[PDB]
Structure 1
Amino acid sequence: EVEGVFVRATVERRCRAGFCFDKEGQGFADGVLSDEQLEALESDPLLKVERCTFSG
């Protein structure tokens, strides 16, 4: 099981091309790959964040 999910329509910093804008991607508290990119992508939320059990 993976612990870590953000499902409150919450905002996170995801960078597409030359800018970082609101979007929900990985949104997990565990990492095995893309750690250096995840840091920029996984900036903790701006707004209310609540976690669930995807169990994927």
Structure 2
Amino acid sequence: EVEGVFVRATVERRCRAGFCFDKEGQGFADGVLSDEQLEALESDPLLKVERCTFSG
């Protein structure tokens, strides 16, 4: 299963090509991989958070 998605149609901080944006709802809560990079990707839900597990 998926512990949480926290999407609400908003990611925390998806930073690519040297610029940090806010979209695509790529929020995860698990230590499967890239936890160090998961800190950077996550840790900034500017807007509201809605958790709807996908049971993946």
List structure 1 segments (4+ residues) > 2 angstroms apart after TM superposition.
Answer: 23-26
CA RMSD of aligned residues (A): 1.7
Question: Displacement of 1:44 after TM fit?
Answer: 3.3
| Structure 1: unaligned runs, 5 residues or longer | none
| Structure 2: unaligned runs, 5 residues or longer | none
C-alpha separation in 2, matches of 1:51 and 1:31: 17
Q: Identity of paired residues, percent?
A: 100
Question: Displacement of 1:30 after TM fit?
Answer: 0.9
Question: How many residues get paired?
Answer: 56
Contact kept? 2:6, 2:52, Cα under 8 Å? yes
Alignment TM-score, normalising by the size of structure 2: 0.76
Alignment TM-score, normalising by the size of structure 1: 0.76
Q: Does 1:45 align with 2:45?
A: yes
